[PDB]
Amino acid sequence: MTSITPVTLANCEDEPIHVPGAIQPHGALVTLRADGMVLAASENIQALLGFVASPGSYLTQEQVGPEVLRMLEEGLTGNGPWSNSVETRIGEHLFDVIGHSYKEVFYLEFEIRTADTLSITSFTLNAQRIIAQVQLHNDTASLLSNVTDELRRMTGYDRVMAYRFRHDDSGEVVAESRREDLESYLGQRYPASDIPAQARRLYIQNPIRLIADVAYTPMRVFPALNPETNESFDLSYSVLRSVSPIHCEYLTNMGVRASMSISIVVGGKLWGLFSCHHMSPKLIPYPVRMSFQIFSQVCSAIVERLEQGRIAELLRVSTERRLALARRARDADDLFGALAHPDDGIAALIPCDGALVMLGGRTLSIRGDFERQAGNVLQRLQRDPERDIYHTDNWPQPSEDSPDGGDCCGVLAIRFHRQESGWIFWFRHEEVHRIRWGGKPEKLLTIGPSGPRLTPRGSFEAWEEVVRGHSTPWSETDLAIAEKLRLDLMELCLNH
Amino acid sequence: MTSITPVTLANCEDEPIHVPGAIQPHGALVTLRADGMVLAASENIQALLGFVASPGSYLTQEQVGPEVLRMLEEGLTGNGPWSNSVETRIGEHLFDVIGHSYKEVFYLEFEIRTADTLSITSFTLNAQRIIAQVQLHNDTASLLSNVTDELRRMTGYDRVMAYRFRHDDSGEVVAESRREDLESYLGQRYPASDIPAQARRLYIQNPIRLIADVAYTPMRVFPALNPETNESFDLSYSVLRSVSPIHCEYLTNMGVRASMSISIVVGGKLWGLFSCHHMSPKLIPYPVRMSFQIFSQVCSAIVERLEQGRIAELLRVSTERRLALARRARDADDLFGALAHPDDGIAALIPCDGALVMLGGRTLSIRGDFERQAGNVLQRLQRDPERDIYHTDNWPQPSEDSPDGGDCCGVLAIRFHRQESGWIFWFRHEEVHRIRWGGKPEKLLTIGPSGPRLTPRGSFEAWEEVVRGHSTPWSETDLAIAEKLRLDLMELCLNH
Ligand SMILES: C=CC1=C(C)/C(=C/C2=[NH+]C(=C\c3[nH]c(/C=C4\NC(=O)[C@@H](C)\C4=C/C)c(C)c3CCC(=O)O)/C(CCC(=O)O)=C2C)NC1=O
Ligand SMILES: C=CC1=C(C)/C(=C/C2=[NH+]C(=C\c3[nH]c(/C=C4\NC(=O)[C@@H](C)\C4=C/C)c(C)c3CCC(=O)O)/C(CCC(=O)O)=C2C)NC1=O
């Protein structure tokens, strides 16, 4: 009948974290139709605010004061995206009342900001010092290190870690600061599934996340669906949003009780995170988290400028080498020897564990003997001979049935002159042996029902599973270099 | 090694604006060794702070209070760069005290925040306004427009301008907001030497300048040379830095009394500026200038994103046309046929008033008849026969004796198959063009007791230059397209 079935092998990369319908109980949620009518609220509204915003009705100044209604009625008469907060005392004690809009729904988030003070809010001066410092760090390694230190100096979280994401969305704990009795996680690596593509999108779109108590009871917002759409409230930009039970379990295995993380975005991609953990409940006043959102935007712009400045230098140096190669082959008595010569040749341009030159049936292998792999890739490309350039980081290595076997799973190949079997190859061995230096963590636990994968060791062992057999991946600069060299060689083939 | 010192191209670039040895008098400067020993001071400290700083002493709590010494000593005991600021009262004045370190020297800068509203000067709520504004714009035209409006609304400067650099480092006022009775500078161009190379480099480093009164007298800092080095104090990052006397003369000839400007940096180049003028002295509290320093980076990142998205779209469409042309040519019996006819063909790739295809001694003309010009250019190109690409917008016209003259100013040509004199041409006729210079670009020289001063223009009257004998310039994208077509047709001739 149905003749189709959605992709459903995964368990919990698809659990939708932007529309959970549940709230962190250190605050309260109220949700409004675009006219202003109350549609749903978190049921702790009475416990914190002393009033019920009755669904199907409107707020009153005798509930929220005028201060909130200035904001909301400039909101309700506003257009496009909206976001604001206001300072007030509700009943006996102080609140931050925070609000935004998304997909025609207007949201009110009430966060407690009581038993803390302007003196404590001197954290605003610390955040502005962090913002002033980062703008002058000269590389991303020192930037991430110093920020990971000073974030902890400021906030007093038990741990802070800098994550950096690789081309495959795997992550590495590239820097750490910790309370010294706690185990270090420096140099851990984890698979891309550790941050599912929805959390990817939310950390790109929503610079700050705060988790006040991993042991929280989630406040059910009621009614559960917006009566106008008859669909879930999209909480993507809220702050009180329910954490996924999977990540609460993962943090409970780590023994974490509260979290804050600060996004770094580059090129519209999640380039990194700072992640802060504390082993007992912790809460940060909203005015400070606004300053960390500002910090996230500043840091993202700085990192993106540094990484673009690095890539431009890579492409510069490679171009200046390749033009010398072209010059030498044009001036010399032979192209083929000038390609294979160790002092300047194809083996110098691209990082490789070996290189092979092929032209007119002549072949040479540099740093090894690769005429087997060259033949085998040609026999693969003989199934698609219109392909000009081929590369892989995961070639099926020659088997142990013969000394023809060997580690060259990385191949990069140029057809520079199809009419005389002019080819160039570069090769790479398997990566993992070079990088195998993250120590496996060992924390003794009463492990949660999901089992040991929701732990740093589980994640590390599941990461090695992912990189087994892969070479060091061919960089976009490497591919650009091969692309350009092909066309430099064609000019010599043409004039020869 | 080199045994010679590089010579600068023009004395415009020689003035070392980073080492004036003086500050603007609306504040004071103290400079300290890495252990906090005083090295040099501005001459006005007692006139402003009430005490004399002596080199070789240390700043004492009786002089600056505990908040400053806490800030400074938390600086000195830090690692790497430092910058911080604190709000404090000294004598009767409220001060902003701004600290930074650069090239192993520590600086303390004092700004009086006298007679201003402590509430509305809150840094974070100022940053909120502009950063909420910038992120709502979909293109650089509306971005620079409404940002220039919000900048004027916030600061109350008499004029704000968006200034955009050209490929020759000239620049043009692309947006403005002004007091109603003032002249409008919108659309005028200004020659490249109005912002010298070293100024543009410094403004890539330091995003914000302010001049509180263009009429100021610099407060010298004594001693002028740092005893640790006997070199000048590099003031590149100081906020009180004495702006160049030449630029103060420039703004005096504009009739401006106070200035602020904000860098826009894209791709590691100074891409443009926001610049602000007031016809009376004006000073902006440091928290607001800090919020503009943040805005400078967020705006630069967003301008970079928008311009990358535009150029990438142009590249996409052009590459699709180039490959469609290659598909036609490779699938045609004569390349020289499929190149010519208006069903795509060469004339479709680049905006041109004429084109010609030449190969093997054949010629064809498109949108006209160009064998005369082509022959003349190729005979001229025998003077540089290794050259494979030639272009001009200013082909030197013949005398008026006949319209047989090869008057076509715009020529672009590529040698795609030298072995058969394979040449392609694109042409553009003259475009009569008009430039409103902001002041006539007279020679920037006056002779006096200093010798020849590089004096700015005598007035800023809009003076029109009428440009004739030029085509529309060949764009860098046009040249990139010609290059890629050259390589594609080199491949195709290599097979043919
Ligand atoms: C070496 C130690 C180590 C640690 C501590 C580690 C944890 C980790 N979880 C993160 C986030 C999330 N993960 C999941 C879901 C799942 N997490 C998985 O691993 C798989 C099984 C799974 C689903 C397929 C979700 C929904 C979120 C978003 C939660 C939210 O923000 O509401 C992040 C980034 C943010 C942060 O720092 O908390 C980190 C760093 N990963 C490691 O390797
Ligand atoms: C309406 C149009 C308009 C334009 C085009 C404009 C340009 C401009 N020049 C700037 C900087 C400098 N220019 C020069 C020197 C030269 N300038 C010239 O004209 C010739 C005579 C000359 C040398 C032979 C120097 C040394 C500096 C560094 C100053 C310092 O930082 O000490 C700045 C940034 C400063 C600011 O915010 O005001 C701007 C915004 N200002 C306008 O209002």
Author numbering:
A (entry chain B), B (entry chain A): 1 to 496
Question: What do the authors of the reporting publication say about this deposited model?
Answer:
They exist in two functional states, Pr and Pfr, distinguished by Z/E isomers of their bilin chromophore.
In order to solve the structure of the PrPfr heterodimer state during dark reversion of PaBphP, we made use of its expected relative concentration as derived from spectroscopic observation, and cryo-trapped the protein on electron microscopy grids at 120 s, 300 and 960 s after photoexcitation with a laser diode at 780 nm. The observed PrPfr heterodimer structure is naturally asymmetric at the tongue and chromophore regions due to the different photochromic states. Instead, we recover high-resolution information at the chromophore and tongue in both protomers, which allows clear assignment to each one of the photochromic states. Turning to the MD simulations of the hybrid PrPfr state, we intriguingly find that the “H–H2O” conformation of H277 in protomer A increases in frequency compared to PrPr (“H-OD” ∼ 23%, “H–H2O” ∼ 18%). This finding is supported by the cryo-EM structures of the hybrid state, where the H277 in protomer A of PrPfr is refined into a position with distance of 2.6 Å and 120° with respect to the D-ring carbonyl, which is a conformation that resembles that of protomer B in PrPr and is unfavorable for direct hydrogen bonding.
